[PDB]
Structures are given as structure tokens and as C-alpha cells.
Short mmCIF file of C-alpha atoms in Angstrom, two decimals:
data_model
loop_
_atom_site.label_atom_id
_atom_site.label_comp_id
_atom_site.label_asym_id
_atom_site.label_seq_id
_atom_site.Cartn_x
_atom_site.Cartn_y
_atom_site.Cartn_z
CA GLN A 58 12.76 -31.76 45.06
CA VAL A 59 12.04 -28.27 46.61
CA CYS A 60 10.11 -27.81 49.89
CA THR A 61 9.77 -25.15 52.53
CA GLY A 62 11.33 -25.08 55.94
CA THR A 63 10.01 -24.53 59.44
CA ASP A 64 9.78 -22.02 62.33
CA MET A 65 9.33 -24.09 65.50
CA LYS A 66 12.60 -23.17 67.23
CA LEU A 67 12.54 -25.09 70.48
CA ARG A 68 8.77 -25.33 70.82
CA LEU A 69 7.58 -28.83 71.68
CA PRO A 70 5.51 -30.49 68.86
CA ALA A 71 1.77 -30.43 69.52
CA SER A 72 1.67 -34.17 68.82
CA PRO A 73 5.18 -35.73 69.25
CA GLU A 74 3.82 -39.10 68.18
CA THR A 75 3.18 -37.69 64.68
CA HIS A 76 6.49 -35.85 64.57
CA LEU A 77 8.25 -38.33 62.35
CA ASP A 78 5.39 -38.39 59.93
CA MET A 79 5.42 -34.62 59.91
CA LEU A 80 9.04 -34.60 58.94
CA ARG A 81 8.75 -37.40 56.47
CA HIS A 82 5.98 -35.82 54.59
CA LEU A 83 7.60 -32.36 54.59
CA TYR A 84 11.09 -33.51 53.60
CA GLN A 85 11.06 -36.91 52.04
CA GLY A 86 12.91 -36.58 48.79
CA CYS A 87 13.52 -32.75 49.18
CA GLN A 88 16.99 -31.49 48.29
CA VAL A 89 16.36 -27.82 48.80
CA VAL A 90 14.74 -26.28 51.77
CA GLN A 91 13.38 -22.78 51.49
CA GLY A 92 13.60 -21.26 54.93
CA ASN A 93 15.05 -23.13 57.97
CA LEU A 94 15.61 -26.82 58.66
CA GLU A 95 14.56 -27.78 62.16
CA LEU A 96 14.65 -31.07 63.94
CA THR A 97 13.66 -30.55 67.55
CA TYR A 98 12.63 -33.16 70.20
CA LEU A 99 13.14 -36.43 68.30
CA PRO A 100 13.44 -39.90 70.00
CA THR A 101 16.61 -41.94 70.29
CA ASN A 102 15.59 -44.52 67.71
CA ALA A 103 13.91 -42.07 65.29
CA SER A 104 14.01 -42.87 61.58
CA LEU A 105 15.18 -39.88 59.54
CA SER A 106 16.26 -41.58 56.29
CA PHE A 107 13.99 -39.30 54.30
CA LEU A 108 16.27 -36.34 55.14
CA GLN A 109 19.26 -37.92 53.35
CA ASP A 110 18.36 -35.82 50.35
CA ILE A 111 18.80 -32.36 51.76
CA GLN A 112 21.61 -30.44 50.12
CA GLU A 113 20.70 -26.88 50.78
CA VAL A 114 19.08 -24.80 53.44
CA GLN A 115 18.23 -21.20 52.75
CA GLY A 116 18.05 -20.30 56.43
CA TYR A 117 19.60 -21.96 59.48
CA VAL A 118 19.92 -25.60 60.48
CA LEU A 119 18.84 -26.52 63.99
CA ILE A 120 19.26 -29.90 65.59
CA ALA A 121 18.06 -29.77 69.18
CA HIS A 122 16.83 -31.87 72.08
CA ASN A 123 17.30 -34.85 69.88
CA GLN A 124 18.24 -38.11 71.36
CA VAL A 125 18.49 -39.40 67.91
CA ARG A 126 21.87 -41.02 67.78
CA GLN A 127 22.33 -40.21 64.07
CA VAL A 128 20.94 -37.41 61.93
CA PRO A 129 22.09 -38.24 58.37
CA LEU A 130 22.09 -34.84 56.65
CA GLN A 131 25.02 -36.19 54.73
CA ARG A 132 24.25 -34.32 51.59
CA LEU A 133 23.99 -30.90 53.19
CA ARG A 134 26.43 -28.60 51.49
CA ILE A 135 25.17 -25.08 51.88
CA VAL A 136 23.53 -23.15 54.61
CA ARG A 137 22.73 -19.69 53.39
CA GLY A 138 21.84 -17.94 56.61
CA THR A 139 19.07 -15.73 55.20
CA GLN A 140 17.51 -15.94 58.65
CA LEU A 141 19.56 -16.93 61.69
CA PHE A 142 19.14 -18.85 64.91
CA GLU A 143 19.08 -16.36 67.75
CA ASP A 144 19.61 -13.89 64.88
CA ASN A 145 23.26 -15.01 64.75
CA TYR A 146 23.82 -18.67 63.99
CA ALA A 147 23.61 -20.60 60.77
CA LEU A 148 24.01 -23.90 62.51
CA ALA A 149 23.08 -24.94 65.98
CA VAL A 150 23.25 -28.31 67.65
CA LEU A 151 21.79 -28.29 71.12
CA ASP A 152 20.94 -30.48 74.10
CA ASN A 153 21.91 -33.86 72.62
CA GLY A 154 22.32 -36.53 75.33
CA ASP A 155 20.58 -37.97 78.35
CA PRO A 156 20.77 -36.11 81.82
CA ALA A 166 21.63 -50.29 77.90
CA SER A 167 23.20 -47.54 75.65
CA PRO A 168 22.20 -43.84 76.24
CA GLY A 169 20.59 -41.70 73.60
CA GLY A 170 21.97 -38.47 72.17
CA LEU A 171 23.48 -37.47 68.88
CA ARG A 172 27.00 -38.86 68.65
CA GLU A 173 28.57 -37.34 65.55
CA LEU A 174 27.25 -35.15 62.77
CA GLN A 175 28.89 -36.85 59.79
CA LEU A 176 28.29 -33.77 57.63
CA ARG A 177 30.80 -34.87 55.05
CA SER A 178 29.21 -32.58 52.54
CA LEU A 179 29.12 -29.36 54.48
CA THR A 180 31.47 -26.88 52.97
CA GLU A 181 29.68 -23.54 53.16
CA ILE A 182 28.05 -21.12 55.53
CA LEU A 183 27.38 -17.78 53.90
CA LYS A 184 26.03 -15.88 56.83
CA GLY A 185 25.83 -16.72 60.51
CA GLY A 186 27.94 -18.53 63.06
CA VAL A 187 27.85 -21.97 64.68
CA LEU A 188 26.63 -23.13 68.13
CA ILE A 189 27.32 -26.57 69.43
CA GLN A 190 26.23 -26.48 73.04
CA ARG A 191 25.13 -28.67 75.93
CA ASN A 192 25.59 -31.85 73.94
CA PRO A 193 27.30 -34.28 76.33
CA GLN A 194 27.10 -37.22 73.94
CA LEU A 195 28.33 -35.36 70.85
CA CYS A 196 31.96 -35.39 69.50
CA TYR A 197 33.96 -33.84 66.61
CA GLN A 198 32.28 -30.44 66.88
CA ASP A 199 35.77 -29.30 67.84
CA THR A 200 37.41 -30.90 64.80
CA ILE A 201 36.20 -28.59 62.07
CA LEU A 202 37.95 -25.74 60.42
CA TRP A 203 34.89 -23.65 60.74
CA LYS A 204 36.68 -20.65 59.29
CA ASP A 205 37.03 -22.49 55.97
CA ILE A 206 33.38 -23.25 55.91
CA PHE A 207 32.44 -19.75 56.74
CA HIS A 208 32.40 -17.82 53.50
CA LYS A 209 34.82 -15.02 52.76
CA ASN A 210 31.94 -12.55 53.13
CA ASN A 211 30.58 -14.15 56.32
CA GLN A 212 31.20 -11.51 58.99
CA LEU A 213 29.99 -13.84 61.74
CA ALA A 214 32.60 -16.49 61.32
CA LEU A 215 32.17 -17.37 64.97
CA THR A 216 31.93 -20.82 66.45
CA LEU A 217 31.10 -21.59 70.05
CA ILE A 218 31.90 -25.10 71.16
CA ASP A 219 30.89 -26.81 74.36
CA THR A 220 33.61 -29.33 75.05
CA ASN A 221 32.23 -30.59 78.35
CA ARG A 222 31.50 -34.02 76.96
CA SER A 223 30.30 -37.10 78.85
CA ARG A 224 31.31 -39.68 76.27
CA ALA A 225 34.67 -41.11 75.32
CA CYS A 226 35.32 -40.79 71.53
CA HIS A 227 37.78 -42.05 69.02
CA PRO A 228 39.90 -39.28 67.47
CA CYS A 229 38.92 -38.26 63.85
CA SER A 230 39.47 -40.83 61.17
CA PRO A 231 43.23 -41.19 60.43
CA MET A 232 42.38 -40.31 56.85
CA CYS A 233 41.23 -36.68 57.73
CA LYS A 234 43.44 -33.80 56.69
CA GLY A 235 44.36 -31.76 59.75
CA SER A 236 42.29 -34.29 61.69
CA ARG A 237 39.36 -32.21 60.55
CA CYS A 238 36.09 -34.27 60.67
CA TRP A 239 32.46 -34.52 61.65
CA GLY A 240 33.00 -38.14 62.70
CA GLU A 241 35.06 -41.32 63.03
CA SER A 242 34.88 -42.63 59.41
CA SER A 243 37.17 -41.72 56.49
CA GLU A 244 33.92 -40.64 54.89
CA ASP A 245 33.30 -38.09 57.68
CA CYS A 246 36.45 -35.92 56.88
CA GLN A 247 36.35 -32.22 56.05
CA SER A 248 36.93 -30.74 52.58
CA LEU A 249 38.42 -27.28 52.36
CA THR A 250 37.06 -24.66 49.96
CA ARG A 251 38.29 -21.13 51.04
CA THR A 252 41.26 -20.87 53.39
CA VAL A 253 43.27 -23.11 51.15
CA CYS A 254 42.61 -21.10 47.88
CA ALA A 255 45.26 -19.57 45.71
CA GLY A 256 45.07 -15.88 44.93
CA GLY A 257 42.64 -15.22 47.75
CA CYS A 258 39.58 -16.30 45.59
CA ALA A 259 36.46 -16.90 47.67
CA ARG A 260 36.13 -20.49 46.57
CA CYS A 261 38.28 -23.19 44.93
CA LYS A 262 38.43 -26.91 44.50
CA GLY A 263 42.07 -27.09 45.58
CA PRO A 264 45.38 -25.24 46.33
CA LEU A 265 46.30 -24.31 42.78
CA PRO A 266 45.22 -21.12 40.95
CA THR A 267 43.88 -23.60 38.44
CA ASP A 268 41.44 -24.68 41.09
CA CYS A 269 39.66 -21.22 41.57
CA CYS A 270 35.97 -21.32 41.02
CA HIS A 271 33.88 -19.03 38.95
CA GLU A 272 32.71 -16.11 41.12
CA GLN A 273 29.14 -17.19 40.72
CA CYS A 274 29.84 -20.66 42.43
CA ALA A 275 28.86 -21.57 45.99
CA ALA A 276 30.78 -23.93 48.21
CA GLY A 277 33.25 -24.88 45.46
CA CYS A 278 33.17 -26.30 41.90
CA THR A 279 34.35 -29.14 39.71
CA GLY A 280 35.98 -26.60 37.37
CA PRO A 281 36.18 -22.83 36.55
CA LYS A 282 33.16 -22.58 34.24
CA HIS A 283 29.71 -21.30 35.19
CA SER A 284 28.42 -24.75 34.37
CA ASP A 285 31.01 -26.40 36.67
CA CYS A 286 29.77 -24.96 40.03
CA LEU A 287 28.49 -27.67 42.33
CA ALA A 288 26.00 -25.08 43.52
CA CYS A 289 25.55 -21.33 42.74
CA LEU A 290 26.50 -18.49 45.03
CA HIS A 291 24.07 -16.55 43.10
CA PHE A 292 21.63 -18.10 40.67
CA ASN A 293 21.22 -21.30 38.73
CA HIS A 294 20.05 -20.63 35.22
CA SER A 295 19.47 -24.07 33.80
CA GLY A 296 22.77 -25.28 35.25
CA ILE A 297 24.54 -21.99 34.62
CA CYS A 298 25.61 -19.83 37.59
CA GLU A 299 25.13 -16.12 37.07
CA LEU A 300 25.29 -13.15 39.46
CA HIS A 301 21.65 -12.46 38.76
CA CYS A 302 18.88 -14.17 36.74
CA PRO A 303 18.51 -12.98 33.12
CA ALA A 304 16.21 -10.06 33.03
CA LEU A 305 12.65 -11.14 32.78
CA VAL A 306 12.25 -8.26 30.34
CA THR A 307 15.29 -7.22 28.32
CA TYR A 308 16.32 -4.17 26.47
CA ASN A 309 16.53 -3.11 22.87
CA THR A 310 19.96 -2.95 21.34
CA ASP A 311 19.70 0.63 20.13
CA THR A 312 17.05 2.25 22.28
CA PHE A 313 17.29 0.19 25.45
CA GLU A 314 13.52 0.19 25.59
CA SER A 315 11.98 -2.71 27.39
CA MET A 316 11.13 -5.80 25.42
CA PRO A 317 10.33 -9.40 26.54
CA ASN A 318 13.33 -11.55 27.12
CA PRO A 319 12.84 -15.11 25.77
CA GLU A 320 15.71 -16.06 28.06
CA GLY A 321 14.29 -14.05 30.97
CA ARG A 322 13.63 -15.77 34.24
CA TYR A 323 12.24 -15.19 37.69
CA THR A 324 14.55 -15.51 40.59
CA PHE A 325 13.51 -18.31 42.89
CA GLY A 326 15.68 -19.04 45.83
CA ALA A 327 19.07 -19.53 44.15
CA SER A 328 17.55 -20.81 40.88
CA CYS A 329 16.13 -19.07 37.76
CA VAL A 330 12.72 -20.24 36.69
CA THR A 331 10.41 -19.90 33.70
CA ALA A 332 7.60 -19.11 36.03
CA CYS A 333 7.35 -19.25 39.83
CA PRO A 334 6.15 -22.62 41.24
CA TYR A 335 2.58 -23.25 42.11
CA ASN A 336 1.56 -21.05 45.06
CA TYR A 337 4.41 -18.59 44.50
CA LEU A 338 4.32 -15.06 43.31
CA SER A 339 5.86 -14.03 40.04
CA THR A 340 6.97 -10.57 40.88
CA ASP A 341 7.26 -8.24 37.89
CA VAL A 342 10.88 -7.47 38.73
CA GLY A 343 11.85 -11.06 37.90
CA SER A 344 11.61 -12.67 41.33
CA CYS A 345 9.59 -15.29 43.28
CA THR A 346 7.98 -14.51 46.57
CA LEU A 347 5.36 -15.54 49.04
CA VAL A 348 4.67 -11.98 49.94
CA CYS A 349 4.51 -9.11 47.37
CA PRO A 350 6.81 -6.07 47.64
CA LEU A 351 5.27 -2.98 49.09
CA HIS A 352 2.81 -1.38 46.68
CA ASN A 353 2.38 -4.58 44.68
CA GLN A 354 -0.67 -6.79 44.81
CA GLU A 355 -0.97 -10.36 43.86
CA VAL A 356 -2.77 -11.26 40.69
CA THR A 357 -3.83 -14.83 40.18
CA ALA A 358 -2.52 -16.44 37.00
CA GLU A 359 -4.50 -18.93 34.95
CA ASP A 360 -1.80 -21.53 35.53
CA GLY A 361 -2.04 -21.62 39.33
CA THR A 362 0.87 -19.31 39.86
CA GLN A 363 0.26 -15.86 41.21
CA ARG A 364 2.10 -12.71 40.16
CA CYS A 365 2.99 -9.38 41.92
CA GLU A 366 2.17 -6.24 40.09
CA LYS A 367 2.42 -2.64 41.10
CA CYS A 368 -0.78 -0.78 42.22
CA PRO A 371 -2.62 3.43 45.10
CA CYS A 372 -3.48 0.06 46.80
CA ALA A 373 -6.75 -1.19 48.34
CA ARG A 374 -7.24 -1.85 52.00
CA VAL A 375 -5.97 -5.34 52.65
CA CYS A 376 -6.97 -7.81 55.42
CA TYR A 377 -3.95 -9.05 57.34
CA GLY A 378 -3.47 -11.99 59.54
CA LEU A 379 -1.00 -13.00 62.14
CA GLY A 380 2.65 -12.66 61.26
CA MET A 381 1.97 -9.70 59.02
CA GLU A 382 2.10 -5.93 59.35
CA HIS A 383 0.69 -4.67 62.64
CA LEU A 384 -0.05 -8.22 63.56
CA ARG A 385 3.54 -9.24 62.94
CA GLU A 386 4.16 -9.65 66.65
CA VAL A 387 0.69 -10.99 67.42
CA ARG A 388 0.43 -14.73 67.88
CA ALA A 389 -3.34 -15.07 68.25
CA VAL A 390 -6.77 -14.02 67.19
CA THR A 391 -8.55 -12.51 70.09
CA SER A 392 -11.73 -10.65 70.92
CA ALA A 393 -9.61 -7.53 70.65
CA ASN A 394 -8.73 -8.10 66.96
CA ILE A 395 -11.42 -10.43 65.69
CA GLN A 396 -13.29 -7.50 64.15
CA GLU A 397 -10.36 -6.73 61.88
CA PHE A 398 -11.31 -9.67 59.75
CA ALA A 399 -14.76 -8.31 59.17
CA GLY A 400 -15.70 -8.20 55.52
CA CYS A 401 -12.67 -10.32 54.33
CA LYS A 402 -12.61 -12.76 51.47
CA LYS A 403 -8.97 -13.37 51.91
CA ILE A 404 -6.57 -12.92 54.75
CA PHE A 405 -3.02 -11.91 54.14
CA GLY A 406 -1.59 -13.81 57.04
CA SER A 407 -2.35 -16.61 59.49
CA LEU A 408 -5.11 -17.24 62.02
CA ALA A 409 -4.65 -18.84 65.42
CA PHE A 410 -7.08 -19.70 68.12
CA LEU A 411 -5.37 -20.47 71.37
CA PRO A 412 -6.87 -21.29 74.78
CA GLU A 413 -5.97 -17.71 75.55
CA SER A 414 -8.19 -16.54 72.70
CA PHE A 415 -11.13 -18.16 74.36
CA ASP A 416 -10.11 -17.77 77.99
CA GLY A 417 -9.49 -14.03 77.68
CA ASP A 418 -6.73 -12.07 79.37
CA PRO A 419 -7.40 -10.20 82.66
CA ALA A 420 -4.08 -8.41 82.31
CA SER A 421 -5.78 -5.97 79.93
CA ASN A 422 -9.33 -6.80 80.97
CA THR A 423 -9.88 -8.45 77.60
CA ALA A 424 -13.01 -10.52 77.26
CA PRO A 425 -12.76 -14.14 75.98
CA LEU A 426 -13.49 -14.72 72.33
CA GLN A 427 -17.04 -15.88 71.90
CA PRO A 428 -18.38 -18.37 69.32
CA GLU A 429 -20.63 -15.69 67.81
CA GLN A 430 -17.57 -13.67 66.96
CA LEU A 431 -16.12 -16.46 64.85
CA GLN A 432 -18.80 -15.79 62.27
CA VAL A 433 -16.42 -13.15 61.02
CA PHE A 434 -14.68 -15.85 59.01
CA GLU A 435 -17.79 -17.18 57.26
CA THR A 436 -17.04 -15.03 54.21
CA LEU A 437 -13.44 -16.13 54.10
CA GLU A 438 -12.50 -18.12 51.09
CA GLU A 439 -8.73 -17.90 51.35
CA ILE A 440 -5.97 -17.97 53.97
CA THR A 441 -2.46 -16.91 52.95
CA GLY A 442 -0.93 -18.30 56.08
CA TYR A 443 -1.92 -21.04 58.43
CA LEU A 444 -4.98 -21.84 60.41
CA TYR A 445 -4.16 -23.02 63.91
CA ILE A 446 -6.90 -24.03 66.24
CA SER A 447 -5.83 -25.32 69.64
CA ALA A 448 -8.95 -24.15 71.32
CA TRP A 449 -12.54 -23.73 70.35
CA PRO A 450 -15.99 -23.27 71.92
CA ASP A 451 -17.47 -26.71 72.56
CA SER A 452 -20.81 -25.19 71.73
CA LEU A 453 -19.71 -25.48 68.12
CA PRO A 454 -19.68 -29.27 67.21
CA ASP A 455 -18.03 -28.57 63.90
CA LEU A 456 -16.03 -25.94 62.15
CA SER A 457 -19.02 -24.25 60.43
CA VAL A 458 -17.04 -21.09 60.74
CA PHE A 459 -14.77 -22.16 57.93
CA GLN A 460 -17.31 -24.13 55.89
CA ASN A 461 -16.89 -21.56 53.13
CA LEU A 462 -13.14 -21.66 53.28
CA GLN A 463 -11.87 -22.86 49.99
CA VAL A 464 -8.19 -22.35 50.01
CA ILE A 465 -5.42 -22.37 52.50
CA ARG A 466 -2.29 -21.30 50.69
CA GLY A 467 -0.20 -21.99 53.73
CA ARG A 468 2.63 -19.79 52.59
CA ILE A 469 3.06 -19.02 56.25
CA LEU A 470 2.90 -22.24 58.27
CA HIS A 471 2.20 -22.85 61.99
CA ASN A 472 5.55 -23.25 63.59
CA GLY A 473 6.52 -23.18 59.92
CA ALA A 474 5.18 -26.73 59.47
CA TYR A 475 1.43 -26.79 59.26
CA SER A 476 -1.00 -25.04 57.05
CA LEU A 477 -3.75 -26.41 59.18
CA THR A 478 -3.63 -27.77 62.68
CA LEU A 479 -6.45 -28.60 64.97
CA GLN A 480 -6.05 -29.85 68.48
CA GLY A 481 -7.93 -30.29 71.74
CA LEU A 482 -11.47 -29.63 70.41
CA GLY A 483 -14.94 -30.90 71.28
CA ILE A 484 -15.97 -30.94 67.63
CA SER A 485 -17.58 -34.12 66.37
CA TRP A 486 -16.84 -33.52 62.65
CA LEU A 487 -15.02 -30.92 60.64
CA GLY A 488 -17.62 -29.98 58.08
CA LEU A 489 -15.27 -28.00 55.81
CA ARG A 490 -17.54 -28.46 52.87
CA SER A 491 -15.97 -25.84 50.66
CA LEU A 492 -12.37 -26.66 51.19
CA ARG A 493 -10.83 -27.38 47.82
CA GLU A 494 -7.22 -26.64 48.24
CA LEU A 495 -4.23 -26.80 50.47
CA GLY A 496 -1.34 -24.98 48.80
CA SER A 497 1.34 -26.05 51.24
CA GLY A 498 2.55 -27.61 54.44
CA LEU A 499 0.93 -30.41 56.33
CA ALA A 500 -2.31 -30.76 58.15
CA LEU A 501 -2.50 -32.15 61.69
CA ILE A 502 -5.50 -33.15 63.72
CA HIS A 503 -5.19 -34.49 67.23
CA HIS A 504 -6.60 -35.06 70.68
CA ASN A 505 -10.09 -34.44 69.55
CA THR A 506 -11.59 -37.59 70.93
CA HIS A 507 -15.07 -36.66 69.86
CA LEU A 508 -13.99 -35.97 66.30
CA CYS A 509 -14.73 -38.33 63.35
CA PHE A 510 -15.10 -38.02 59.56
CA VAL A 511 -11.32 -38.15 59.39
CA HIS A 512 -11.06 -40.87 56.77
CA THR A 513 -14.13 -39.74 54.87
CA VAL A 514 -12.40 -37.07 52.81
CA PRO A 515 -9.56 -38.34 50.64
CA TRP A 516 -7.10 -35.64 51.44
CA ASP A 517 -5.46 -36.08 48.10
CA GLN A 518 -8.19 -33.97 46.56
CA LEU A 519 -7.02 -30.90 48.46
CA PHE A 520 -3.32 -31.48 48.26
CA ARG A 521 -1.34 -29.83 45.51
CA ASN A 522 2.15 -31.18 46.01
CA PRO A 523 4.21 -34.31 47.04
CA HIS A 524 4.93 -33.00 50.50
CA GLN A 525 1.40 -32.75 51.72
CA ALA A 526 -0.20 -35.17 54.15
CA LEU A 527 -2.65 -35.49 56.99
CA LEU A 528 -1.20 -36.43 60.28
CA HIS A 529 -3.60 -37.62 62.91
CA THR A 530 -3.98 -39.09 66.37
CA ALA A 531 -6.17 -39.37 69.44
CA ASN A 532 -9.32 -38.54 67.56
CA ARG A 533 -12.55 -40.43 67.98
CA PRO A 534 -11.63 -44.05 67.22
CA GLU A 535 -12.99 -44.98 63.85
CA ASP A 536 -14.52 -48.14 65.22
CA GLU A 537 -16.38 -46.30 67.92
CA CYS A 538 -17.76 -43.73 65.37
CA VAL A 539 -18.97 -46.30 62.87
CA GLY A 540 -20.42 -48.22 65.81
CA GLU A 541 -22.91 -45.33 66.17
CA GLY A 542 -23.82 -45.68 62.54
CA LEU A 543 -21.72 -42.70 61.55
CA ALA A 544 -20.75 -42.94 57.97
CA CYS A 545 -21.09 -40.89 54.76
CA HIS A 546 -24.44 -40.84 53.15
CA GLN A 547 -24.69 -43.42 50.32
CA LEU A 548 -25.84 -40.55 48.13
CA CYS A 549 -22.28 -38.94 48.33
CA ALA A 550 -19.94 -39.45 45.47
CA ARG A 551 -17.76 -42.41 46.42
CA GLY A 552 -19.28 -42.35 49.88
CA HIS A 553 -16.94 -39.45 50.66
CA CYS A 554 -17.94 -36.57 53.04
CA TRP A 555 -16.81 -34.00 55.62
CA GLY A 556 -19.24 -35.02 58.31
CA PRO A 557 -22.56 -36.79 58.80
CA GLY A 558 -25.52 -36.01 56.52
CA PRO A 559 -25.90 -35.48 52.69
CA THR A 560 -25.02 -31.83 53.27
CA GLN A 561 -21.46 -32.88 53.96
CA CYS A 562 -20.74 -34.84 50.67
CA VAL A 563 -17.40 -34.02 49.01
CA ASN A 564 -19.27 -34.27 45.71
CA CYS A 565 -22.84 -35.33 44.70
CA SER A 566 -23.56 -38.34 42.53
CA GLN A 567 -26.89 -36.87 41.38
CA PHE A 568 -27.89 -33.28 42.01
CA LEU A 569 -28.05 -30.95 44.94
CA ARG A 570 -30.87 -29.51 46.97
CA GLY A 571 -29.15 -26.57 48.53
CA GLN A 572 -26.01 -28.34 49.71
CA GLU A 573 -27.52 -31.75 50.18
CA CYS A 574 -26.96 -34.46 47.56
CA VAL A 575 -30.37 -35.66 46.52
CA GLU A 576 -32.19 -38.05 44.16
#
């Protein structure tokens, strides 16, 4: 039902051939996307039926470089704009069309889109796309949307039928009567932000987003603010309430944490239950996470300890890689509050600053690491290291921060023959992708279901050592391994032991 979004922008996928699986696993059956929704570089005949469910995007929606003729986000209603494309646009459709039939997105058919809270719209360089000029974008933009700006590229290369004859004002996202625009703001009596029609009787409860089916807080089709068990309120009920006479704090049985635009009993697995009554991925300043017995984590106020940070956080916020210059900052860590990334640059070095290449002996810094808050991205690696022994003691990747916003773990272009991640027990989020590691095997030897914690997790893989070639060398899990399942060759690599261990080897 709820899944996170992505942060790829216009970056090409590392493995385009796995792109549809990436998207299917991340979004199939997801109605609400935390963060941004991005579809970039899809093929003409791509199958995106799994995205028919999305109703809401917290951030921006980007459709770009897609030759996909149809992108059926027909249930999308609300784009919140909490983060914007180019820091300004809630919606962007870019580069759709070729330079017997041509590819390129033809129409958007967003029959459901009625609200943009923040951010503008960009529909540019899309020679095969029509009806981007047939929307009353100012109605969609919310009353409090200061960037109610739409830029349309009308230099089209395709002849199109005018909007369905059934569209009011000829306002549509397409040629069908089902592709016509609904109006929720600029048609509202009394100047109310949202309504379901032209009468004062049609004004929606203030707490409603994108319209309503009636004036009650239970009639909102979506909340502007928060959904408390179907009830829209301007805030979630205080997690801790106050005494009638003294106003002293006391637990609120009706108290909830704010999650997205919903109120929850407790924050979802791998989210932080902040003491203030909110759900985060990252604790507020001067609050540390505390792990709960139920798999949730909570943020409580500290006088804080020194904390290990990874990429995308703090002073490493603008740093996209682990290098020989910053590898030492992970010394002594059990957990990293951020991501790790090993790029060819990490291992090639960078003469611009006379920085030495990262050496394999420096990767030992992660041997004490049990948990990664963000993602682990390895697109380079010493070939002197046949496995990932470096992370053999890694137990958990929370993946709150994903690579390109999609992967909690990606490995590509390595000389490793097996992974060997003996201690890995959990993947909190995102997908994993392994590719173009033609020496690598022990891919199908670890049911990945044992590490996954939610319905949107999957392993994507390609261009690894062919399974047939690997087993042809006699490479298989030791018969002593529980279920014959392992991370690599040898009894030392068993996912579990049927008998007992000798050190890490399963023995009898």
C-alpha cells in the first residue's frame, strides 16, 4: 500500500534491462509514494500496469526520456511537492518521442489529477505528446501554491484529435471522455480552497485535499493535512495529551504519530517514532534513535554522542563517494548514519587534488559495521578481493536512503566470484541489484526472502556468472548447509547450519 519514492533524476539506470523489474517490485500495488515518483528511460513497449495504483506522491512526479506510449498513472490525484524537480516543479514530462509507429508518450490520461500543493509544471521537448496545453493548471494548483506556473512546449511533431467532446472547457489529458479534467478550486463558491462543485454546499472541509464527497472530515477524498482513521484533521491527535485541569502531560489513548499525511498507532517498520508525534527516517537534531522491541525505532532527545555519518548526511551531504580521503571517518563504526558508495573514482583516485586511489586494505574499516542507514553502492572494487569480506559482518541495511532513491544495495562491474555476506540478516527497504559481474555466482543460493522485510523488496539481477557455467565447475552449497543454502562456496558460507558450527563452518 505505502512505498518510498526515488532520486534518480535523469541518471541512466545501471542496468536498463532490469528497469521494469525495479519499478514493478518498488511500486506494484503501492498507492502512496513517500518521496518522488520517477520513471526515466523506459522502452516504447514497456509494461507499467503495476503503477495503476498510485494515488499520491509526496514529492514530484517525473516522466522523462520515456518512449513508453502510455504511462497509466490514472489514479494519481495529489502531488504534494515536498521536494521539487529543479527545485521548482511538481510535475515534469520530458523528452518523450523519437528524434512502423514511433515511440513516445502520447497523452497523459491523468483523469484523477486534481491537486498540486507546491511546485509548477514542465512539459517540454515532447514532440509526440498532446493535451499538455488543455489543462486548467491554475485549478489544479492549490490556493496556497505560489508557483502556479506551467511551461508548455507546443512544438509537437504529431497530429492529435482535439480533447474529447465531453470535456468541460475542452480541458483534458487525452482523447477519451474518461480523460477530461475535474475542477476543484477556481470554480468554488465563497473562495474556499477546495470544493466538489460550484455551490457553497459543495465546499470541502478545510482539512481535505484535492476535493471531497461532502463537507465532513470523513468525506475528504484525501486529507490536506492528516488522515486519522479516515478523519481529516489539521494535525494528528497529540501523542501525549493534557490534563483537563492542570494541563500536565498524560498519555493520549487517541494519540498518533504523524506519518506522511496519515496518523498512525506506531510508525511502520524501519521508521522512527519521534517523541513529538511524528514519523521520520532521520531524527530531529539532538534526538537519537532508540530501537523498539517491535521493529520500529523511536527518536528521543539526548548532549549527544559522536555519530558516524555516511554519504548524503551532514558534512557528507554533498559527497557522492567514499574515497581514500574520507574512508578513515568510518573507523570504529558499528552503524553508519548515511550511505556508502564505491565508484571507479574511489578506486582510481583523483589527480585534481592529488588524492590516492582507495586501496583494498582500507576497506577493512567496514568490518565492524553491522548496520547501514542508507544504501550501499558498489560500482567498483579491487579485483584482489574475490568476495565482499569487507561486509561479511554487515547485518542490516535499513536502506532509508536509497541509491538513486531506488536501491538499498547495488553491486555492479566487479571481479568478485561470490558475495559472502554471511551475516546479512536484514534489508529494511528498497531493492537490491547485482549486475555485470560475470565472475560472480552464489546468486540463487540465498533465498532473498529471508532478508526482505516488506512486499516491495526483490533482487534484480543480470550479466552475472551464468548459473550453468558455475555449477559446471562443481560450485554449489555444501550439503551440510541448511536447505543447501549459502552465500558462497564452502561450509563457512551456509545461511544456517543443519548441525553445529566449528567457527563459522557447519560441521558434523
